[PDB]
Tab-separated table of C-alpha atoms in Angstrom:
chain	number	residue	atom	x	y	z
A	1	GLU	CA	16.971	-12.230	20.744
A	2	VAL	CA	15.105	-12.968	24.176
A	3	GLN	CA	11.541	-13.920	23.609
A	4	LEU	CA	8.794	-14.344	26.152
A	5	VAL	CA	5.850	-16.578	25.419
A	6	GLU	CA	2.841	-16.879	27.708
A	7	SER	CA	0.558	-19.978	27.772
A	8	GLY	CA	-2.428	-20.834	30.146
A	9	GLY	CA	-4.835	-18.348	29.088
A	10	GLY	CA	-8.669	-18.993	28.278
A	11	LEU	CA	-11.741	-19.616	30.143
A	12	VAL	CA	-11.982	-20.060	34.052
A	13	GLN	CA	-15.088	-20.149	36.081
A	14	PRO	CA	-15.669	-17.569	38.772
A	15	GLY	CA	-14.027	-18.788	42.109
A	16	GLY	CA	-11.608	-21.046	40.179
A	17	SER	CA	-8.009	-20.629	39.532
A	18	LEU	CA	-5.708	-19.525	36.706
A	19	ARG	CA	-2.095	-20.988	36.090
A	20	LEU	CA	0.046	-19.279	33.524
A	21	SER	CA	3.357	-19.800	32.312
A	22	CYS	CA	6.015	-17.658	30.581
A	23	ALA	CA	8.674	-19.525	28.754
A	24	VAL	CA	11.822	-17.559	28.138
A	25	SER	CA	13.881	-18.373	25.068
A	26	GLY	CA	17.022	-16.761	23.711
A	27	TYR	CA	17.903	-15.726	27.379
A	28	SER	CA	18.742	-17.559	30.789
A	29	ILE	CA	16.026	-16.838	33.323
A	30	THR	CA	18.610	-16.829	36.212
A	31	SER	CA	20.209	-13.661	34.406
A	32	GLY	CA	17.182	-11.487	34.394
A	33	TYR	CA	16.917	-8.969	37.376
A	34	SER	CA	13.448	-9.698	37.911
A	35	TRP	CA	10.444	-11.339	36.193
A	36	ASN	CA	7.029	-9.768	36.323
A	37	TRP	CA	3.227	-10.197	35.555
A	38	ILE	CA	1.340	-7.173	34.519
A	39	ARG	CA	-2.262	-7.340	33.374
A	40	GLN	CA	-4.735	-5.333	31.333
A	41	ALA	CA	-8.562	-5.451	31.623
A	42	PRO	CA	-10.356	-5.025	28.136
A	43	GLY	CA	-10.081	-1.600	26.956
A	44	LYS	CA	-8.664	-0.506	30.288
A	45	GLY	CA	-5.014	0.479	31.422
A	46	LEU	CA	-2.065	-1.543	32.887
A	47	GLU	CA	-1.866	-3.021	36.395
A	48	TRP	CA	1.454	-4.489	37.560
A	49	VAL	CA	0.690	-7.655	40.078
A	50	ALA	CA	3.779	-9.425	40.824
A	51	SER	CA	7.689	-9.658	40.770
A	52	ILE	CA	10.195	-12.134	41.551
A	53	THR	CA	13.720	-10.891	41.529
A	54	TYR	CA	16.839	-12.932	40.803
A	55	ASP	CA	17.614	-14.076	44.537
A	56	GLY	CA	13.865	-15.246	44.612
A	57	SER	CA	12.259	-12.518	46.652
A	58	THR	CA	8.783	-12.178	45.680
A	59	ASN	CA	6.314	-9.150	45.737
A	60	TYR	CA	2.789	-8.591	44.930
A	61	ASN	CA	0.301	-5.512	44.404
A	62	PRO	CA	-1.913	-5.154	47.449
A	63	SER	CA	-4.721	-5.227	44.826
A	64	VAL	CA	-4.506	-8.783	44.738
A	65	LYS	CA	-2.127	-9.994	47.373
A	66	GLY	CA	-3.565	-12.912	49.323
A	67	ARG	CA	-4.704	-14.818	46.212
A	68	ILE	CA	-1.538	-14.718	43.873
A	69	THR	CA	1.733	-16.503	43.595
A	70	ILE	CA	4.760	-16.070	41.388
A	71	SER	CA	7.432	-18.657	40.927
A	72	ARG	CA	10.229	-19.931	38.766
A	73	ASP	CA	11.475	-23.108	37.412
A	74	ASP	CA	15.076	-22.511	36.313
A	75	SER	CA	15.369	-25.979	34.884
A	76	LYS	CA	12.528	-25.194	32.494
A	77	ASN	CA	13.723	-21.413	31.888
A	78	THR	CA	10.020	-20.577	32.868
A	79	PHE	CA	8.146	-18.697	35.522
A	80	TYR	CA	4.588	-18.932	36.504
A	81	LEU	CA	1.625	-16.876	38.043
A	82	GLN	CA	-1.025	-18.727	40.074
A	83	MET	CA	-4.309	-16.849	41.077
A	84	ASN	CA	-7.251	-18.217	42.962
A	85	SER	CA	-10.866	-17.126	43.887
A	86	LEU	CA	-11.107	-15.530	40.585
A	87	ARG	CA	-13.796	-12.829	39.892
A	88	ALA	CA	-15.066	-10.885	36.828
A	89	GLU	CA	-12.575	-8.184	37.646
A	90	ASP	CA	-9.781	-10.768	36.759
A	91	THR	CA	-10.761	-10.979	33.130
A	92	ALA	CA	-7.697	-9.572	31.338
A	93	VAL	CA	-4.680	-10.016	29.170
A	94	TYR	CA	-1.878	-11.132	31.354
A	95	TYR	CA	1.760	-10.159	30.197
A	96	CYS	CA	5.093	-11.430	31.423
A	97	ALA	CA	7.859	-8.960	31.419
A	98	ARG	CA	11.456	-8.494	32.220
A	99	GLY	CA	12.652	-5.789	34.597
A	100	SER	CA	16.152	-4.140	34.279
A	101	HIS	CA	19.577	-4.260	36.250
A	102	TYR	CA	19.847	-0.612	35.743
A	103	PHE	CA	18.203	2.653	36.353
A	104	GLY	CA	15.993	1.722	39.357
A	105	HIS	CA	14.958	-1.901	37.964
A	106	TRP	CA	11.304	-1.496	37.747
A	107	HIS	CA	10.526	-0.731	34.164
A	108	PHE	CA	10.022	-3.291	31.582
A	109	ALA	CA	11.865	-3.380	28.446
A	110	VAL	CA	11.022	-7.033	27.233
A	111	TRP	CA	7.347	-8.324	27.168
A	112	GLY	CA	5.744	-11.478	26.098
A	113	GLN	CA	2.696	-11.275	23.793
A	114	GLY	CA	-0.075	-11.461	26.338
A	115	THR	CA	-2.645	-14.177	27.011
A	116	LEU	CA	-6.393	-13.529	27.616
A	117	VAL	CA	-7.942	-14.913	30.789
A	118	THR	CA	-12.049	-14.835	30.727
A	119	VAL	CA	-13.688	-15.222	33.930
A	120	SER	CA	-17.131	-16.545	33.331
A	121	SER	CA	-19.738	-19.291	33.965
A	122	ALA	CA	-20.473	-19.528	30.325
A	123	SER	CA	-19.490	-22.690	28.197
A	124	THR	CA	-16.827	-22.884	25.503
A	125	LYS	CA	-18.178	-22.857	21.923
A	126	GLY	CA	-16.167	-22.943	18.641
A	127	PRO	CA	-17.160	-20.566	15.845
A	128	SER	CA	-18.932	-21.194	12.584
A	129	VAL	CA	-16.994	-19.836	9.703
A	130	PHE	CA	-19.042	-18.373	6.714
A	131	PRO	CA	-17.831	-16.953	3.337
A	132	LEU	CA	-18.305	-13.373	2.357
A	133	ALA	CA	-18.040	-13.944	-1.385
A	134	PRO	CA	-16.959	-11.349	-3.643
A	135	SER	CA	-19.408	-10.086	-6.220
A	136	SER	CA	-20.486	-7.236	-8.271
A	137	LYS	CA	-21.737	-5.594	-5.072
A	138	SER	CA	-18.233	-6.047	-3.332
A	139	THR	CA	-16.427	-4.288	-6.405
A	140	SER	CA	-15.057	-0.676	-6.568
A	141	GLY	CA	-12.915	-0.144	-9.678
A	142	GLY	CA	-10.840	-3.143	-10.393
A	143	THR	CA	-10.937	-3.941	-6.718
A	144	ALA	CA	-13.002	-6.594	-4.948
A	145	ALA	CA	-13.640	-7.275	-1.539
A	146	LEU	CA	-14.166	-10.882	0.129
A	147	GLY	CA	-13.888	-12.093	3.631
A	148	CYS	CA	-15.043	-14.530	6.284
A	149	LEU	CA	-17.611	-14.294	8.973
A	150	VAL	CA	-16.559	-16.024	12.253
A	151	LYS	CA	-19.808	-16.507	14.120
A	152	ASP	CA	-20.905	-17.683	17.608
A	153	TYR	CA	-17.956	-18.509	19.686
A	154	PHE	CA	-16.801	-18.097	23.284
A	155	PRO	CA	-14.508	-17.134	24.899
A	156	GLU	CA	-12.255	-14.712	22.915
A	157	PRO	CA	-9.811	-14.729	21.240
A	158	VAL	CA	-9.879	-16.104	17.576
A	159	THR	CA	-7.052	-15.448	15.009
A	160	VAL	CA	-7.407	-15.078	11.409
A	161	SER	CA	-4.991	-15.316	8.845
A	162	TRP	CA	-5.252	-15.438	4.938
A	163	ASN	CA	-3.469	-17.852	2.620
A	164	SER	CA	-1.472	-19.173	5.556
A	165	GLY	CA	-0.149	-15.755	6.261
A	166	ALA	CA	1.067	-14.987	2.805
A	167	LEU	CA	-1.740	-12.499	2.283
A	168	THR	CA	-1.447	-9.446	4.430
A	169	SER	CA	-1.889	-6.327	2.164
A	170	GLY	CA	-5.524	-5.053	2.182
A	171	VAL	CA	-6.586	-7.563	5.064
A	172	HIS	CA	-8.660	-6.056	7.874
A	173	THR	CA	-9.825	-8.154	10.771
A	174	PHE	CA	-12.283	-6.347	12.766
A	175	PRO	CA	-12.808	-6.406	16.504
A	176	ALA	CA	-15.262	-9.006	17.578
A	177	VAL	CA	-18.722	-7.912	18.919
A	178	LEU	CA	-20.458	-9.579	21.665
A	179	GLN	CA	-23.867	-10.487	20.623
A	180	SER	CA	-26.924	-10.480	22.861
A	181	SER	CA	-26.675	-14.130	22.679
A	182	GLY	CA	-23.615	-13.970	24.840
A	183	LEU	CA	-21.536	-15.224	21.996
A	184	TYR	CA	-18.895	-13.257	19.929
A	185	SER	CA	-18.783	-12.679	16.272
A	186	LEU	CA	-16.091	-11.180	14.002
A	187	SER	CA	-15.200	-10.566	10.300
A	188	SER	CA	-12.087	-10.489	8.265
A	189	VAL	CA	-12.070	-9.026	4.847
A	190	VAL	CA	-9.420	-8.519	2.269
A	191	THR	CA	-9.556	-6.220	-0.867
A	192	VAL	CA	-7.840	-7.834	-4.022
A	193	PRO	CA	-7.647	-7.165	-7.728
A	194	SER	CA	-10.889	-8.013	-9.361
A	195	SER	CA	-8.824	-9.786	-12.014
A	196	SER	CA	-7.458	-12.171	-9.549
A	197	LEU	CA	-10.569	-13.831	-8.499
A	198	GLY	CA	-10.675	-16.272	-11.334
A	199	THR	CA	-6.987	-17.358	-10.723
A	200	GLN	CA	-5.821	-16.863	-7.154
A	201	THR	CA	-7.155	-18.998	-4.270
A	202	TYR	CA	-8.239	-17.077	-1.304
A	203	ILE	CA	-8.344	-19.142	2.054
A	204	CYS	CA	-9.119	-17.737	5.476
A	205	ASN	CA	-7.439	-19.538	8.279
A	206	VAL	CA	-9.327	-19.387	11.424
A	207	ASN	CA	-8.215	-20.810	14.953
A	208	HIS	CA	-10.105	-20.551	18.252
A	209	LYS	CA	-7.695	-22.294	20.475
A	210	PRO	CA	-10.171	-22.043	23.543
A	211	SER	CA	-12.233	-24.723	21.721
A	212	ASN	CA	-9.298	-26.137	19.586
A	213	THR	CA	-11.241	-25.449	16.398
A	214	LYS	CA	-9.126	-24.680	13.428
A	215	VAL	CA	-11.018	-24.038	10.030
A	216	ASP	CA	-9.600	-23.209	6.557
A	217	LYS	CA	-12.282	-21.795	4.532
A	218	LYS	CA	-11.898	-21.247	0.646
A	219	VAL	CA	-13.872	-18.136	-0.418
A	220	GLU	CA	-14.744	-17.703	-4.074
A	221	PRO	CA	-17.243	-15.760	-6.241
A	222	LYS	CA	-20.785	-17.122	-5.935
B	1	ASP	CA	-0.107	4.088	46.073
B	2	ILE	CA	1.397	6.843	43.717
B	3	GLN	CA	-1.533	7.820	41.348
B	4	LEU	CA	-0.593	8.969	37.660
B	5	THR	CA	-2.837	11.264	35.772
B	6	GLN	CA	-2.174	11.750	32.012
B	7	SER	CA	-3.287	14.705	29.908
B	8	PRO	CA	-5.031	14.706	27.559
B	9	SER	CA	-6.690	11.274	27.452
B	10	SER	CA	-6.924	11.509	23.674
B	11	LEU	CA	-5.570	13.724	20.798
B	12	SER	CA	-5.594	14.041	17.059
B	13	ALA	CA	-2.826	15.910	15.279
B	14	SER	CA	-1.660	16.595	11.858
B	15	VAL	CA	1.101	14.190	10.342
B	16	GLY	CA	4.609	15.709	11.186
B	17	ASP	CA	3.266	17.968	13.877
B	18	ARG	CA	4.808	18.335	17.485
B	19	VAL	CA	2.835	16.306	20.205
B	20	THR	CA	3.033	16.636	24.016
B	21	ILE	CA	1.656	14.430	26.565
B	22	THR	CA	1.691	15.158	30.245
B	23	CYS	CA	1.821	13.081	33.298
B	24	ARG	CA	1.168	14.073	36.733
B	25	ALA	CA	1.968	11.990	39.808
B	26	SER	CA	0.248	12.183	43.232
B	27	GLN	CA	3.596	12.446	44.971
B	28	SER	CA	7.387	12.771	43.935
B	29	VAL	CA	9.087	10.095	42.000
B	30	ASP	CA	12.523	11.605	42.428
B	31	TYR	CA	15.274	9.736	44.178
B	32	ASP	CA	19.066	10.660	44.577
B	33	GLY	CA	19.358	12.825	41.311
B	34	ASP	CA	16.883	10.808	39.225
B	35	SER	CA	13.303	10.947	38.468
B	36	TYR	CA	11.791	7.299	38.021
B	37	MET	CA	9.108	7.952	35.441
B	38	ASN	CA	8.897	5.789	32.364
B	39	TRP	CA	7.008	5.961	29.220
B	40	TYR	CA	5.453	3.299	26.914
B	41	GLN	CA	3.702	3.033	23.514
B	42	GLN	CA	1.026	0.350	23.038
B	43	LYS	CA	0.085	-0.497	19.499
B	44	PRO	CA	-3.326	-2.431	19.034
B	45	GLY	CA	-3.149	-6.206	19.809
B	46	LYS	CA	0.519	-5.683	20.930
B	47	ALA	CA	2.372	-5.473	24.409
B	48	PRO	CA	3.359	-2.116	25.447
B	49	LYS	CA	6.995	-1.065	24.124
B	50	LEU	CA	9.279	0.993	26.420
B	51	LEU	CA	10.317	4.358	25.094
B	52	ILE	CA	11.748	6.415	27.845
B	53	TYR	CA	13.207	5.380	31.255
B	54	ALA	CA	14.363	7.407	34.217
B	55	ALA	CA	12.195	10.364	32.785
B	56	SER	CA	14.519	11.253	29.823
B	57	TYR	CA	16.569	8.448	28.804
B	58	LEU	CA	15.757	7.032	25.227
B	59	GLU	CA	15.425	3.274	25.120
B	60	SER	CA	17.726	1.549	22.643
B	61	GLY	CA	16.175	1.497	19.153
B	62	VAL	CA	13.402	3.790	19.689
B	63	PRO	CA	13.634	6.848	17.231
B	64	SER	CA	14.988	9.966	18.354
B	65	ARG	CA	11.692	11.878	17.708
B	66	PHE	CA	10.600	10.621	21.262
B	67	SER	CA	11.787	12.485	24.215
B	68	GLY	CA	10.988	12.865	27.850
B	69	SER	CA	11.352	15.681	30.357
B	70	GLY	CA	10.389	16.604	33.818
B	71	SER	CA	11.053	15.858	37.573
B	72	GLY	CA	9.215	15.655	40.870
B	73	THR	CA	5.603	14.995	39.923
B	74	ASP	CA	5.369	16.580	36.545
B	75	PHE	CA	6.550	14.854	33.329
B	76	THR	CA	6.264	15.288	29.575
B	77	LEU	CA	6.502	12.942	26.645
B	78	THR	CA	7.137	14.770	23.167
B	79	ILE	CA	6.994	13.485	19.919
B	80	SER	CA	8.872	16.210	17.990
B	81	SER	CA	7.135	15.195	14.540
B	82	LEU	CA	4.358	12.804	14.793
B	83	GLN	CA	4.671	9.886	12.061
B	84	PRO	CA	1.968	7.773	10.603
B	85	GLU	CA	3.294	4.710	12.650
B	86	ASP	CA	2.858	6.632	16.009
B	87	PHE	CA	-0.783	5.820	16.214
B	88	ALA	CA	-0.843	4.229	19.660
B	89	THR	CA	-1.954	4.639	23.408
B	90	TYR	CA	0.951	6.015	25.338
B	91	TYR	CA	1.314	5.251	29.197
B	92	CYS	CA	3.401	6.715	31.889
B	93	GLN	CA	4.623	4.458	34.614
B	94	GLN	CA	6.578	5.211	37.902
B	95	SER	CA	9.105	2.986	39.285
B	96	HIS	CA	9.972	5.004	42.249
B	97	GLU	CA	7.957	2.543	44.565
B	98	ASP	CA	5.860	-0.701	44.496
B	99	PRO	CA	3.226	-1.168	43.437
B	100	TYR	CA	4.572	-0.003	40.253
B	101	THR	CA	1.651	2.010	38.654
B	102	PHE	CA	0.736	3.371	35.211
B	103	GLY	CA	-1.129	6.341	33.935
B	104	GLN	CA	-4.623	5.871	32.429
B	105	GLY	CA	-3.283	6.190	28.876
B	106	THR	CA	-3.383	8.714	26.114
B	107	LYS	CA	-4.427	7.773	22.774
B	108	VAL	CA	-2.896	9.435	19.789
B	109	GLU	CA	-4.192	9.341	16.143
B	110	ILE	CA	-2.972	11.066	12.967
B	111	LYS	CA	-5.276	13.655	11.463
B	112	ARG	CA	-5.316	13.145	7.777
B	113	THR	CA	-7.264	14.613	4.981
B	114	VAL	CA	-11.000	13.602	4.558
B	115	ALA	CA	-11.145	10.140	2.862
B	116	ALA	CA	-14.621	8.892	1.929
B	117	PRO	CA	-15.307	5.243	2.397
B	118	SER	CA	-15.734	2.485	-0.150
B	119	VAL	CA	-18.823	0.657	0.372
B	120	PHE	CA	-19.306	-3.068	-0.075
B	121	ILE	CA	-22.403	-5.455	1.109
B	122	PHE	CA	-22.358	-9.146	1.358
B	123	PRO	CA	-25.616	-11.070	1.423
B	124	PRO	CA	-25.864	-14.167	3.823
B	125	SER	CA	-24.230	-17.336	2.599
B	126	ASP	CA	-26.276	-20.463	1.720
B	127	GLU	CA	-24.283	-22.159	4.154
B	128	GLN	CA	-25.364	-19.914	7.049
B	129	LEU	CA	-28.987	-19.902	5.806
B	130	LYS	CA	-29.108	-23.755	6.140
B	131	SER	CA	-28.548	-23.082	10.053
B	132	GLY	CA	-31.522	-20.784	10.531
B	133	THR	CA	-30.027	-17.294	10.711
B	134	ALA	CA	-29.123	-14.696	7.979
B	135	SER	CA	-26.183	-12.178	8.561
B	136	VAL	CA	-25.929	-9.395	6.055
B	137	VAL	CA	-22.505	-7.523	6.166
B	138	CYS	CA	-21.728	-3.960	5.032
B	139	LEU	CA	-18.143	-2.869	4.709
B	140	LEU	CA	-16.888	0.675	4.799
B	141	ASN	CA	-13.189	0.586	3.644
B	142	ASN	CA	-10.380	2.982	4.091
B	143	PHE	CA	-12.084	6.345	5.306
B	144	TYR	CA	-11.202	9.205	7.561
B	145	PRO	CA	-12.263	10.614	10.268
B	146	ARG	CA	-13.411	7.598	12.085
B	147	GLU	CA	-16.968	8.830	12.419
B	148	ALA	CA	-19.577	7.259	10.135
B	149	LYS	CA	-23.101	6.422	10.121
B	150	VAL	CA	-24.383	3.086	8.802
B	151	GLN	CA	-28.187	2.639	8.392
B	152	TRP	CA	-29.788	-0.685	7.463
B	153	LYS	CA	-32.974	-0.840	5.398
B	154	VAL	CA	-34.850	-3.960	4.446
B	155	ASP	CA	-37.751	-3.242	1.681
B	156	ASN	CA	-37.168	0.446	2.774
B	157	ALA	CA	-37.904	-0.076	6.620
B	158	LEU	CA	-35.174	1.325	8.762
B	159	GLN	CA	-33.661	-1.366	10.773
B	160	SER	CA	-33.008	-0.251	14.525
B	161	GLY	CA	-31.348	-2.519	17.237
B	162	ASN	CA	-30.509	-5.612	15.223
B	163	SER	CA	-27.147	-4.682	13.734
B	164	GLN	CA	-23.702	-4.389	15.383
B	165	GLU	CA	-20.439	-2.605	14.282
B	166	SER	CA	-16.837	-2.797	14.545
B	167	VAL	CA	-14.143	-0.364	13.422
B	168	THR	CA	-10.287	-1.206	13.029
B	169	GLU	CA	-7.513	0.627	14.565
B	170	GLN	CA	-6.093	3.479	12.479
B	171	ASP	CA	-3.987	1.984	9.613
B	172	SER	CA	-0.583	3.274	9.703
B	173	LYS	CA	-0.183	2.749	5.789
B	174	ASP	CA	-2.587	5.681	4.803
B	175	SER	CA	-3.922	6.774	8.376
B	176	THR	CA	-7.406	5.267	7.364
B	177	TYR	CA	-10.069	3.433	9.334
B	178	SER	CA	-12.372	0.647	8.140
B	179	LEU	CA	-15.670	-0.545	9.562
B	180	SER	CA	-17.873	-3.645	9.548
B	181	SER	CA	-21.619	-3.653	10.302
B	182	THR	CA	-23.678	-6.908	10.513
B	183	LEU	CA	-27.364	-7.221	10.338
B	184	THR	CA	-28.881	-10.189	11.856
B	185	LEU	CA	-32.425	-11.606	10.904
B	186	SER	CA	-33.881	-14.878	11.217
B	187	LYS	CA	-33.692	-16.951	8.003
B	188	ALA	CA	-37.655	-16.835	7.901
B	189	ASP	CA	-37.609	-13.016	7.956
B	190	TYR	CA	-34.692	-12.891	5.539
B	191	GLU	CA	-36.637	-14.942	3.086
B	192	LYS	CA	-39.792	-12.874	3.698
B	193	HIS	CA	-38.102	-9.655	2.101
B	194	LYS	CA	-36.447	-8.589	-1.129
B	195	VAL	CA	-34.387	-5.406	-0.842
B	196	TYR	CA	-31.450	-5.104	1.451
B	197	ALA	CA	-29.716	-2.032	1.665
B	198	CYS	CA	-26.893	-0.355	3.809
B	199	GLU	CA	-26.925	3.402	3.641
B	200	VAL	CA	-23.610	5.275	4.693
B	201	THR	CA	-23.250	8.895	5.826
B	202	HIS	CA	-19.628	10.490	6.314
B	203	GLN	CA	-18.160	13.565	6.047
B	204	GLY	CA	-16.326	12.551	2.761
B	205	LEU	CA	-19.618	12.029	1.007
B	206	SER	CA	-21.752	14.927	-0.190
B	207	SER	CA	-24.832	12.599	-0.019
B	208	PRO	CA	-25.347	9.445	1.495
B	209	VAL	CA	-24.191	6.434	-0.363
B	210	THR	CA	-26.482	3.255	-0.529
B	211	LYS	CA	-25.241	-0.344	-1.489
B	212	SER	CA	-27.971	-2.827	-2.052
B	213	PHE	CA	-29.036	-6.178	-3.332
B	214	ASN	CA	-32.035	-8.002	-4.241
B	215	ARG	CA	-32.332	-11.522	-2.527
B	216	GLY	CA	-32.143	-14.073	-5.126
B	217	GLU	CA	-30.810	-12.161	-8.155
């Protein structure tokens, strides 16, 4: 299967520049009709910003034309987005996407996973990870809730898994909130059988790539 | 630019019901016998997924309950029978001319029967207290509808302005929501009080539910 994987997201200062890449696997980049960047500001809609077709012609949305460049490296099977003079309006998830050889070309059947660019003057800060221990006050029937609090980090995002991805049922990872301090906080909880607390280990795996902070936190009854 | 306006911007529908979303373009997207309108489905945390291209063609692998119609400036996406996995924001997109533009998005949720939350409360950890701050967390699990009210009380004083909350997307497994609320206090304030309570009001509860603990015990 063709897979598109973006890299280059993270924190950029206002007036700085971003450089994103999309590595294409399972498919030769020279065979695509077009390769594209489309972005989505937090909680807003989708904006196409740039395309490069198979003959190398480029095109840009006039909303950003003048400070954006798209390019390809066929030998690395990768294409790139460069933008400069960044402003708060440019904070967004940036997606790469493939156009079609058919039916007018400019619709997008294959997309990457998106990478978040945050334009801000603030500093990177990695999170503290605290346990939300199961107890009598987090039990309903023979079900217990436990979790991890991922507190005081910047910028987004953080990922959380449980037991290295082996535990997915009953997991709820909540959207982060922005505190008045300017730092994010989020929680991830899981409900599990009360009878498993003595015998099953529960570890939350936190990763804040912007600060290269990885934490594995074992959560147990207090 | 061609501007696309979707209607409605959000809807809630019983499971299995027919759902219709419309898109109106500021100028025609017709060309030579085809209509260059496309539809996408975006689930939380995911890239959009193409459903319909050239106004009425179903993308490979997409379930046949999705269909598109229309021409000129007026287009419809129909879900013939809404399924629990269909919670998403749906976008139209014209490919008639650059810049390619998308509608603003229509949010779709499944209207299921009322379900009251399970409520759980977590005191601050001793690890956090070491650092000078105390976070108290209240979890409302697996409830419907999304509207819920959480009130924090500390020794029976209503707390206002020192908590934040967050809600998950609708879970397609049972069409429910969950919600987390965090009360933040200084360690010194936390150690000055005894009873910590989160009081929950919701359509599924005939009276409010309070979960509480006593600091220490």
